Structures are given as structure tokens and as C-alpha cells.
């Protein structure tokens, strides 16, 4: 049943690609090297467009897409784990859109390969990326699987606080080592986010499966906490819409099943 539903979801994604969900910007010769993976490009229709430092001739491109939230606002930015040479673009994104919380679902190294560059911290070790200065104010464990880093970010004489939550043990294609710790991540993200329309920044290595699982869980939790559930509410519909905004948002049958069980638990 769930396996049939997820298969239907993949059929629709395949159809969208054949029909022409476009990927022109991501395919520009000036942009190709900014993609972590050749097979994961952001859809033009929902891609994140960077205008910070425009006047200086900086490119508008980053491999990342907006995903709409329960209220129809632009509630998430789903993006890849930054590369050595797109760290500056990552911070441009965080700064332009007033991001207060970053959720990271991957590690720097997975399966022996580099999966995401460190863009934060560390203790007594500030990070300078272009005109950005990142300083580690404090860090601590939210729980055994999640680090919470409090960052001071400085750009053009202005300073902001940005929080980063990193989940340590969630493999690509699969599910988190602790489902309760994942929910605690989302809960703490929301506490830090507070009120305010700024999007949450969510990323994994590719910005697909683990990223989409997180966004979906927050989406449904927000629905549960803030709105009346539509009498025809459907997880199929939600995930389908997610995939329409970010490629392979929810990448795998396993993750789709995980989502269903998690959502049913949240509803109770």
C-alpha cells in the first residue's frame, strides 16, 4: 500500500521531468561546478535566487529551493551541503533571507567521502568566508545525537545570531538513529525560530531525502499545532508537493514509510 503510494509518487516525478519542472539555471556552464552532484539540480520554478552583492557581479545561483509551509508562506529553504567554493554562497543565502535556524541532517564525512563542508565555528577559531565573519558563541548537545551551535555572523558592520542544529547519526536513504531525537530537533528549531516569517534553512548532503523528511515532519507538526486538519488531508499529497519543489524530497520508500509512522504517531 505504502509501497504502491511511493511508487506512484516516483511515477509523477518522472513525468514532470519528461514534460519539462525545469533546470536551466543549474545547467548553465557558469553554475555546473556549484552542484555537489550532477544528478541533483534545483528546479527553476522554486529555486533560491541570491541578490546579495548583486552590484559586485556575484552570481544568483545556489543549489537550493524554497518549499512552502502550512500557511502557504516560503517556510523552508532546502539546499545541499555547501562545497569548499560555495561556502560564501551559503552564507549569502542565510543572510539575504534572514535565516535564524539551520538544520543539518548529515555529517562532513559519510562512507569515507566528503559530504558537506564545515561552514560554522569553531571554539576560539572564527571562520572568514569572503565578507562574512562567523564566530562560535557557544555549543552544546541538545541530546546525544544533536549538537546545537550558537553562531555570531558578521557582514558589512551588522551582526546577527544564527543557530545550527546538526543531527549526527542519520544515513542518507535511511532513517534517523533515534526518531524521538529527530522530533526534539524540530521542536527546538521551532523554539529558536520563535515568531517571525523567516524560512528555516534545512540541508543534508544533496539536500534531498533527509532534508525532505525534516521539512515534511515540521510541516505536519505545524499543521497539527496551528491549523484545522483538512478532512481530506493526505500524506501522499504533501510529499508529492514537496517533491515538486525540491527534487527527491523524500527519496526512498523506507523514508516514506518512516514519515507515515511518524505522522500517525504525531496525530496520535
Amino acid at each position: 500500500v505504502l509501497a504502491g503510494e511511493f511508487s506512484d509518487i516516483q511515477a509523477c516525478s518522472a513525468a514532470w521531468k519528461a514534460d519539462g519542472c525545469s533546470t536551466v539555471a543549474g545547467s548553465r556552464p557558469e553554475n555546473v561546478r556549484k552542484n555537489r552532484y550532477k544528478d541533483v539540480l534545483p528546479y527553476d520554478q522554486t529555486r533560491v535566487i541570491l541578490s546579495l552583492l548583486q552590484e559586485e557581479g556575484h552570481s544568483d545561483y545556489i543549489n537550493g529551493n524554497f518549499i512552502r509551509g502550512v500557511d502557504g508562506s516560503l517556510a523552508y529553504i532546502a539546499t545541499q551541503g555547501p562545497l569548499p567554493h560555495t561556502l560564501l554562497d551559503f552564507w549569502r543565502l542565510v543572510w539575504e533571507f534572514g535565516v535564524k535556524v539551520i538544520l543539518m541532517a548529515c555529517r562532513e564525512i559519510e562512507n569515507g567521502r566528503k559530504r558537506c563542508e564545515r561552514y560554522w565555528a569553531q571554539e576560539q577559531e572564527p571562520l572568514q568566508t569572503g565578507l562574512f565573519c562567523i564566530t562560535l558563541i557557544k555549543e552544546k548537545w541538545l541530546n546525544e545525537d544533536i549538537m546545537l551551535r550558537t553562531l555570531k555572523v558578521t557582514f558589512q558592520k551588522e551582526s546577527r545570531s544564527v543557530y545550527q542544529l546538526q543531527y549526527m547519526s542519520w544515513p542518507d536513504r535511511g532513517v534517523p538513529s533515534s526518531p524521538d531525537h529527530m522530533l526534539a530537533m524540530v521542536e527546538e528549531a521551532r523554539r529558536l525560530q520563535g515568531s517571525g516569517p523567516e524560512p528555516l534553512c534545512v540541508h543534508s548532503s544533496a539536500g534531498c531525502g533527509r532534508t525532505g523528511v525534516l521539512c515534511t515532519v515540521d510541516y505536519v507538526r505545524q499543521l497539527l499545532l496551528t491549523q484545522m486538519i483538512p478532512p481530506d488531508f493526505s500524506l501522499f499529497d504533501v510529499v508529492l508537493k514537496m517533491r515538486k519543489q525540491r527534487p527527491a524530497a523524500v527519496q526512498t520508500e523506507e523514508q516514506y514509510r518512516f514519515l507515515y509512522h511518524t505522522v500517525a504517531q504525531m496525530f496520535c
Binding site: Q10, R36, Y37, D39
Partner: peptide, 7 residues
């Protein structure tokens, strides 16, 4: 260099 090989 691919992430969605099996997906």
C-alpha cells in the same frame, strides 16, 4: 558523482 543512482 551521482546521489540518486538507485532512486
Amino acid at each position: 558523482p551521482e546521489y540518486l543512482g538507485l532512486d
